[PDB]
Amino acid sequence: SSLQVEISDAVSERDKVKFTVQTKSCLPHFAQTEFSVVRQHEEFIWLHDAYVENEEYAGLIIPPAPPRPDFEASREKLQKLGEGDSSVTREEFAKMKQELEAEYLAIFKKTVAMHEVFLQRLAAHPTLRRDHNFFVFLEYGQ
Amino acid sequence: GPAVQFFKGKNGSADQVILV
């Protein structure tokens, strides 16, 4: 009956954000008791919209969908950091690198938390935790 | 391409980013 879900790590790519979703569970439906999948932001939204649209869940409250993380400004700094070379000293590069990492770290902390909380709210809900789409979201693509 | 990896810190270690 147990279901525990969390996000262990994430990667921001040029155009995409991926979250690694970890599940520990004793529920017999799953192939394994501990497993992982990778999920882009989009798929959290698909799962949320599918809950909201499903008439079987009338009378239930669906946890709010996580916002789309915004790395746009940071990606352009990251691209420039690779390119700039031109007369940038090693000391300047190291400092630019250090501040950009801090910039990404904060964005990551917040978006991972909001994505994770969404899933944990689903896993705690006595009805929503049994949704078929949720099982697909947690397990598909081993 | 250029990417940033994020690893959540497992108690008590700190969260980490890696520029790649």
CATH fold name of chain A: PX Domain
How many domains is the backbone of chain A divided into? 1
User: From the helix content, strand content and strand pairing of chain B, which structural class follows?
Assistant: mainly beta
**Ends of chain A: how far apart?**
21 Å
Oligomer: heterodimer
CATH superfamily of chain A: Phox-like domain
Strand content of chain B: 35-45%
Q: List the secondary-structure elements of chain B in sequence, H or E.
A: EE
Number of strands of chain A: 3
Main β sheet profile of chain B: 2 strands, antiparallel
First-to-last CA distance of chain B: 8 Å
Helix and strand pattern of chain A: EEEHHHH
Q: From the helix content, strand content and strand pairing of chain A, which structural class follows?
A: alpha+beta
Any idea what the radius of gyration of chain B is?
10 Å
Classify the helix fraction of chain A into a percent range: 40-55%
* Strand residues, percent of chain A: 15-25%
What's the level 1 CATH class of chain A?
A: Alpha Beta
Q: Architecture of chain A, CATH level 2?
A: 2-Layer Sandwich
User: What spatial form of chain A do the alpha-carbon principal axes imply?
Assistant: elongated
PDB class: protein transport
Keywords: PX domain, protein transport
Assembly: dimeric
Entry title: Structure of the SNX32 PX domain in complex with Chlamydial protein IncE in space group I121
Question: What's the short story on this structure?
Answer:
It is classed as protein transport. Chain A has 142 residues and is an alpha+beta fold.
